[PDB]
Amino acid sequence: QVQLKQSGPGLVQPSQSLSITCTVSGFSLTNYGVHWVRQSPGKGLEWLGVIWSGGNTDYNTPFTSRLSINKDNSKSQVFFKMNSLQSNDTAIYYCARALTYYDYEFAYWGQGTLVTVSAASTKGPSVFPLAPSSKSTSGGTAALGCLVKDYFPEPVTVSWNSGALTSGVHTFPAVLQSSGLYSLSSVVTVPSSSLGTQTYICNVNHKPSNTKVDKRVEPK
Amino acid sequence: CQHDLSTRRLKC
Amino acid sequence: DILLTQSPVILSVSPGERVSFSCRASQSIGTNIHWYQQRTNGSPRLLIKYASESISGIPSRFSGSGSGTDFTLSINSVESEDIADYYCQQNNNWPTTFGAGTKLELKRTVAAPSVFIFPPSDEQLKSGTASVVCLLNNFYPREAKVQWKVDNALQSGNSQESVTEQDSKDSTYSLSSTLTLSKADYEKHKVYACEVTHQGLSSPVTKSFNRG
Ligand SMILES: *[C@@H]1O[C@H](CO)[C@@H](O)[C@H](O)[C@H]1NC(C)=O
């Protein structure tokens, strides 16, 4: 199976450098070029450059002087570095592979790496239960969730029961509070009859702050 | 439109 | 650079209907155009290469046509799974450039929200902050009103809303309204009510609790 896995998301201070590692498998960097594309709020999708099979690189024009791409064929790793970031360099960065060795139709993408350029500091979330009760149980169906509060920067991941519960799960888009910190809720609906039997746990991972929390959510 | 980095979806 | 203009900005169709996305180039580019899908939280998925050529694993309902400067991506019978943004990419000229994307939204029948209200946790209260969450679950269409009342006082400016993207299975939305108070303020009051208004409700639904 062809795959590309990028290093995790995080903060970069203004005027600092971005480093992302792409680890590929299912093919050899000696036979394929690896491309970098980002996705920004303003410009949208924007091709940044490529490191070719033989090690040659091209960079899109405006990144000539601040982009460097390298790789280690043996380790199947491609390294992306970009100097002196500013706020508008906040984007999701991706690595991609084309269908053929020389081409640009991107059939394989990394999962992306959300990079935030900000002067602030990283802060993990506190995780609070959103407890089911009668005020949240209508017609045999109960709602329950986790409040994931006061973190920075995005993103944060939430799953339920280690991935085993996905049906009826809504994880809300984060909102920025006046504190400059993000907050979101993740909720799920389950049979009320299972509240006694089943354990419900929201798994929260804030990769930028290395905060992993498992919050058990119970009726009060 | 605008590209939302949280949802990876267009936002209008 | 070649500028790719995708129009319109938003498409809204009903399931089973056919839909077309337009990609226009600022300069002739042959058939050197590729198309991508972006679902909620995903990376782009390649749908069509070189205007019209199939990609393996992609449903047959996806096709594309055009040459020169005027291109079309087509879904002959849209499914709810097709909710996404759609991008075109040119590579006749270096550097390769992408359009700005078109949003595909699905219509469905009206569905009233289920409303649930969640008091602050005793856990959160220990920090000197109270969040009161009001959930509106699985409704259509997106428009909804959440009005907050604390002891019959209308709350304003102290709540934030968040709406999920459209669900790929049932095409509904869910909404969270979060009311935020100091612990001190929260403690000084008793009745917390969120009131919900929606096209599918024949009258507003109120969910509420008394603190303790
Ligand atoms: C960021 O600002 C620079 C000018 O300093 C501009 O040339 C560039 O296009 C901007 N990039 C984005 C992604 O907005």
Author numbering:
A (entry chain B): 1 to 220
B (entry chain E): 1 to 12
C (entry chain A): 1 to 212
Paper text:
Multiple strategies have been developed to modify monoclonal antibodies, including chemical conjugation and protein engineering. Owing to the location of the binding site within the Fab, we have termed the peptide a meditope (medi-, middle, + -tope, place).
In one case, the substitution of Phe3 by histidine led to a change in the rotamer conformation, in which the imidazole ring flipped to a solvent-exposed position. The imidazole ring is rotated ∼170° around the Cα—Cβ bond, losing the potential π-stacking with the highly conserved Gln–Gln interaction between the light and heavy chains.
